[PDB]
Design an enzyme around this catalytic site. Structure first.
Site, PDB file in Angstrom:
ATOM      1  N   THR A 166       2.752   9.269  -6.472  1.00  0.00           N
ATOM      2  CA  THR A 166       1.664   9.073  -7.386  1.00  0.00           C
ATOM      3  C   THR A 166       1.386  10.344  -8.106  1.00  0.00           C
ATOM      4  O   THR A 166       1.291  10.385  -9.274  1.00  0.00           O
ATOM      5  CB  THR A 166       0.405   8.581  -6.648  1.00  0.00           C
ATOM      6  OG1 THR A 166       0.746   7.501  -5.828  1.00  0.00           O
ATOM      7  CG2 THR A 166      -0.646   8.134  -7.570  1.00  0.00           C
ATOM      8  N   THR A 167       1.295  11.404  -7.359  1.00  0.00           N
ATOM      9  CA  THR A 167       1.063  12.738  -7.869  1.00  0.00           C
ATOM     10  C   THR A 167       2.177  13.207  -8.780  1.00  0.00           C
ATOM     11  O   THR A 167       1.977  13.929  -9.691  1.00  0.00           O
ATOM     12  CB  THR A 167       0.919  13.686  -6.697  1.00  0.00           C
ATOM     13  OG1 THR A 167       0.041  13.109  -5.775  1.00  0.00           O
ATOM     14  CG2 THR A 167       0.411  14.978  -7.077  1.00  0.00           C
ATOM     15  N   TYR A 190      -1.353  -4.382  -8.008  1.00  0.00           N
ATOM     16  CA  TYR A 190      -1.648  -5.238  -9.138  1.00  0.00           C
ATOM     17  C   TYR A 190      -1.267  -6.713  -8.927  1.00  0.00           C
ATOM     18  O   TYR A 190      -2.100  -7.507  -8.898  1.00  0.00           O
ATOM     19  CB  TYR A 190      -1.092  -4.678 -10.437  1.00  0.00           C
ATOM     20  CG  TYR A 190      -1.037  -5.677 -11.537  1.00  0.00           C
ATOM     21  CD1 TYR A 190      -2.163  -6.274 -11.994  1.00  0.00           C
ATOM     22  CD2 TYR A 190       0.143  -6.046 -12.103  1.00  0.00           C
ATOM     23  CE1 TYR A 190      -2.134  -7.194 -12.908  1.00  0.00           C
ATOM     24  CE2 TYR A 190       0.181  -6.972 -13.077  1.00  0.00           C
ATOM     25  CZ  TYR A 190      -0.978  -7.540 -13.485  1.00  0.00           C
ATOM     26  OH  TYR A 190      -0.997  -8.446 -14.468  1.00  0.00           O
ATOM     27  N   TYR A 225       3.089   3.231   2.599  1.00  0.00           N
ATOM     28  CA  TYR A 225       2.024   3.840   1.856  1.00  0.00           C
ATOM     29  C   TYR A 225       0.855   2.881   1.585  1.00  0.00           C
ATOM     30  O   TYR A 225       0.981   1.936   0.886  1.00  0.00           O
ATOM     31  CB  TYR A 225       2.621   4.405   0.583  1.00  0.00           C
ATOM     32  CG  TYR A 225       1.762   5.203  -0.323  1.00  0.00           C
ATOM     33  CD1 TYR A 225       0.514   5.620   0.031  1.00  0.00           C
ATOM     34  CD2 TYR A 225       2.205   5.523  -1.571  1.00  0.00           C
ATOM     35  CE1 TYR A 225      -0.212   6.350  -0.815  1.00  0.00           C
ATOM     36  CE2 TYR A 225       1.483   6.239  -2.413  1.00  0.00           C
ATOM     37  CZ  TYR A 225       0.275   6.630  -2.046  1.00  0.00           C
ATOM     38  OH  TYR A 225      -0.394   7.339  -2.932  1.00  0.00           O
ATOM     39  N   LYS A 234       1.756   6.583   5.546  1.00  0.00           N
ATOM     40  CA  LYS A 234       0.925   7.367   4.711  1.00  0.00           C
ATOM     41  C   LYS A 234      -0.359   6.629   4.501  1.00  0.00           C
ATOM     42  O   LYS A 234      -0.366   5.672   3.791  1.00  0.00           O
ATOM     43  CB  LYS A 234       1.621   7.609   3.400  1.00  0.00           C
ATOM     44  CG  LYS A 234       0.894   8.566   2.494  1.00  0.00           C
ATOM     45  CD  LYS A 234       1.627   9.045   1.258  1.00  0.00           C
ATOM     46  CE  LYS A 234       0.661   9.622   0.244  1.00  0.00           C
ATOM     47  NZ  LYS A 234       1.224   9.720  -1.070  1.00  0.00           N
ATOM     48  N   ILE A 290       0.632  14.357   3.701  1.00  0.00           N
ATOM     49  CA  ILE A 290       1.393  14.220   2.505  1.00  0.00           C
ATOM     50  C   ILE A 290       0.393  14.600   1.450  1.00  0.00           C
ATOM     51  O   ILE A 290      -0.474  13.873   1.154  1.00  0.00           O
ATOM     52  CB  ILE A 290       1.984  12.800   2.302  1.00  0.00           C
ATOM     53  CG1 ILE A 290       3.081  12.541   3.312  1.00  0.00           C
ATOM     54  CG2 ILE A 290       2.573  12.671   1.002  1.00  0.00           C
ATOM     55  CD1 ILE A 290       3.363  11.144   3.584  1.00  0.00           C
TER      56      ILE A 290
HETATM   57  N1  LIG Z   1       7.017  -4.159 -11.928  1.00  0.00           N
HETATM   58  C1  LIG Z   1       6.629  -3.214 -13.011  1.00  0.00           C
HETATM   59  C2  LIG Z   1       7.400  -3.497 -14.309  1.00  0.00           C
HETATM   60  C3  LIG Z   1       7.059  -4.810 -15.017  1.00  0.00           C
HETATM   61  C4  LIG Z   1       7.531  -4.756 -16.472  1.00  0.00           C
HETATM   62  C5  LIG Z   1       7.619  -6.134 -17.141  1.00  0.00           C
HETATM   63  N2  LIG Z   1       6.300  -6.766 -17.399  1.00  0.00           N
HETATM   64  C6  LIG Z   1       5.115  -3.205 -13.264  1.00  0.00           C
HETATM   65  O1  LIG Z   1       4.391  -4.140 -12.893  1.00  0.00           O
HETATM   66  O2  LIG Z   1       4.591  -2.246 -13.853  1.00  0.00           O
END
Ligand SMILES: N[C@@H](CCCC[NH3+])C(=O)O
Ligand SMILES: N[C@@H](CCCC[NH3+])C(=O)O
Lengths: 307, 307
Positions: B49-50, B112, B136, B164, B203
């Site tokens: 991430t860093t 996400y 992680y 982590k 870490i």
């Molecule tokens: N898996 C990656 C790439 C997706 C790109 C296509 N929408 C993400 O969610 O950022």
């Protein structure tokens, strides 16, 4: 053009269906889009959260947005999800998406790799000039609530059509009271969002299953009764993270193949039986497809990691 | 060997420096790595991430791992961040990362695009057989806490090196009392994690700036005084999301160029002025580099979106 997006009341975040090896099932996808159109959906989100865009190569993604535009763009608004946690990725995707003819872009704030508020502004301002744009706020997925301040700052763009809001009806209202077009992204909340909180409509999950009823809910006055009756379905779809439920349900209805791209896996047998009952309570004629609902066996489902 | 990874006490989540056009500054990178080595860091994370791995293309990322392994592999452990919200991406990157000689893989849960607990297991089980793995957990970024149940399930793999953990010290102890190696992912908690809660180490972000002091904190016994001393730096570093703070601080010290990949933007002048005084109080000699710390002008900073 922005106004053409601003008027949409029902947008389906369409699921993306797969062939047995993981590649896109375009034949199935086209039938779903058709069914959405037949029942009054005015826009589609292509490769949204529901659409598993996060699981696409940019490749696939742009191709799908383009296919959708070429086949269906005269009949429905196409909103490509060309957002990214990376600015470079978003600029480049958005510009390719608009080039293949999309009507708008959906843009989330950067997930996982969280930036500052100043950073949000830079990020959004880097794609907003490209066309009609809907900003996506969903902090439960991204880890960051986009504050209304940022929204108003970027709303200085003529290209901002509105927000896809997931924080709740109260936020939707902070915005709609202040000249900002909002679509609710929560199906369980969207009736009230529309009739009590000033929301223009929904960007819907549940629409993939019951597009006619969803349209009914939004177009024809208050209907808490219809709202209550679809609520058991909604609760089922959100028990596990979307789109685990929808994928499972679309397979049970026989409109998509029982193929999952990892990291998603189907709902267990007990849930699937439950779906069948939920379907009969509501009436099968309200769901997409013609085929009799199945429970399905665990062994019917294919999980793909390498595709 | 997993046991080689399990004994590491100080891992640096190394930053990725850029040329003025946005491309990797390999000269500056090699020099940051050397600095780490000289002060006794035992491992690096490449594109964590860093490290803004989130802003890398896959060719860049893999190249950076392979480069780090080739140039520094005999003298420091190289842990590639080949994690992804997509199982497919994670599979390909992990295998490629191991094929170029990395020592371990860092694997986050899917950000996400949230999955189920069962999905989690399937995701991790796709990559676990590939080599030594650190899992992680940072739900503030991902939107999802990896429950200990999941970790226990995956810990059936001999390739699990450890976790982590970013949830807190209580969680760590829960793992450490139960035979699981853990490194704290939070700098303001790492001292107490190691001495009071059974953590094997850190870490670290802060080791990017003050590697010697971090080593001291973790190697030479309980030291509440040193911990209180670094604490103003650690606070400053996390006021905005990491690595906005780090990026700007390294540029103030002159070890990197003042180039940002969007969506990160630098800290403002007042905060930069404040870094100058934090450096004074800790002593510039504990910080990386040889140059006098500068405040820098806003005009000095370069923000890149297309790179
Ligand atoms: N898996 C990656 C790439 C997706 C790109 C296509 N929408 C993400 O969610 O950022
Ligand atoms: N922005 C994308 C691509 C990452 C590229 C490799 N580290 C993601 O976070 O998944």
């Amino acid at each position: 053009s922005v106004d053409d997006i601003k008027s949409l009341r029902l947008i389906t975040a369409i699921k993306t269906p797969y062939l047995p090896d993981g590649r896109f099932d375009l034949e199935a996808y086209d039938a779903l889009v058709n069914m959405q159109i037949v029942d009054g959906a005015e826009g589609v989100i292509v490769g949204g959260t529901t659409g598993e865009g996060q699981l696409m190569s940019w490749d696939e993604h742009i191709m799908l947005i383009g296919h959708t535009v070429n086949c269906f763009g005269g009949s429905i608004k196409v909103i490509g999800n060309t957002g990214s946690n990376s600015t470079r990725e978003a600029i480049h995707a958005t510009e390719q998406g608009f080039a293949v003819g999309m009507h708008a872009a959906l843009h989330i704030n950067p997930y996982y790799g969280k930036t500052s508020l100043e950073g949000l502004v830079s990020h959004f301002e880097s794609v907003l000039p490209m066309g009609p744009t809907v900003i996506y706020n969903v902090p439960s997925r991204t880890g960051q609530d986009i504050p209304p301040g940022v929204i108003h700052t970027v709303a200085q763009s003529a290209n901002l059509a509105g927000v896809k809001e997931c924080v709740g009806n109260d936020r939707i209202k902070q915005y709609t009271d202040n000249r900002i077009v909002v679509w609710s992204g929560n199906d369980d909340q969207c009736h009230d969002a529309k009739w009590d909180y000033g929301a223009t409509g929904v960007i819907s999950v549940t629409s993939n299953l019951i597009p006619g009823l969803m349209r009914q809910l939004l177009f024809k006055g208050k209907n808490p009764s219809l709202n209550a009756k679809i609520m058991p379905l909604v609760n089922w779809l959100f028990e596990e993270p979307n789109p685990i439920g929808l994928n499972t349900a679309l397979a049970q209805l026989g409109v998509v193949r029982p193929v999952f791209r990892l990291p998603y896996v189907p709902l267990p047998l007990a849930k699937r039986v439950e779906f069948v009952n939920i379907v009969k309570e509501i009436g099968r004629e309200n769901f997409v497809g013609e085929k009799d609902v199945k429970v399905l066996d665990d062994d019917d489902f294919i999980l793909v990691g390498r595709y």
